[PDB]
């Protein structure tokens, strides 16, 4: 079964500025993406230090990027720490309450979209480019799940009945029709480069 949830009122209202806003710098949804798995990596390599069996769902420590024009999807693997049932319903709408009022704060000051990671609300930045987002993720204590929102103030959950995936977290964006350069080799190239070149573990990505 799929259940449906509200976000917060504060998550809903940020979720429609980063759509509503006129804002061209769209590419910076890419690094907030790489830096949260980057922590998610850093995460379960931190907990393998004391207990080397966190690692028996895979040792590899590393992100793909995946590009998939039939679909029109990016989609941005990590095997990091996962997300359980908890994280999804629960502890995500926790930190990102904070998160996006101290944001929508600042962007008064005239700080800007881009600064989104700061405040530990970079993921919803997904929504410059992708009409919706599926999150696939699969932490060592919990079953796989999948998390989807197209935005307008609600999101499901499911256990998800795909291939499994060890550990980790896949963010799957089906992209908004004319977002398809993030498609592109050389232009996702460009933008690794340009925000995410200094990552503590290997980015592969992916050819069609
Ligand atoms: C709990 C918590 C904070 C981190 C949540 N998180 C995020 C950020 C995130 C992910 C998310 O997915 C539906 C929704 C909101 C959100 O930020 C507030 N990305 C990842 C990721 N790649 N791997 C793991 F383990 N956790 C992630």
Redesign the pocket.
């Known amino acids: 079964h799929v259940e449906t949830f509200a976000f917060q009122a504060e998550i809903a209202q940020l979720m429609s500025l980063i759509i509503n806003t006129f804002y061209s710098n769209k590419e910076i949804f890419l690094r907030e993406?790489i830096s949260?798995?980057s922590?998610?990596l850093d995460?379960?390599r931190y907990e393998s230090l004391t207990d080397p069996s966190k690692l028996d769902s895979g040792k590899e420590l590393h992100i793909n990027l995946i590009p998939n024009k039939q679909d029109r999807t990016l989609t941005?693997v990590?095997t990091?720490?996962?997300?359980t049932k908890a994280?999804?319903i629960n502890?995500?709408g926790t930190?990102?309450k904070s998160?996006t009022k101290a944001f929508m704060e600042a962007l008064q000051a005239g700080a800007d979209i881009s600064m989104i990671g700061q405040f530990?609300?970079?993921?919803?930045s997904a929504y410059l480019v992708a009409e919706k987002?599926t999150?696939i993720?699969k932490?060592n204590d919990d079953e796989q799940y999948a998390?989807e929102?197209s935005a307008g103030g609600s999101?499901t959950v499911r256990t998800d009945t795909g291939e499994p995936m060890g550990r980790?977290?896949k963010?799957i964006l089906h992209l908004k029709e004319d977002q398809t350069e993030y498609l592109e080799e050389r232009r996702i190239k460009e933008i690794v480069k340009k925000h995410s070149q200094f990552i503590g573990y290997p980015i592969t990505l992916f050819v069609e």
């Open positions: 993406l949260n798995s922590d998610a995460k379960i941005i990590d990091g720490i996962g997300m994280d999804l502890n995500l930190i990102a998160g530990g609300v970079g993921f919803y987002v999150v993720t932490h998390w929102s999101f980790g977290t963010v």
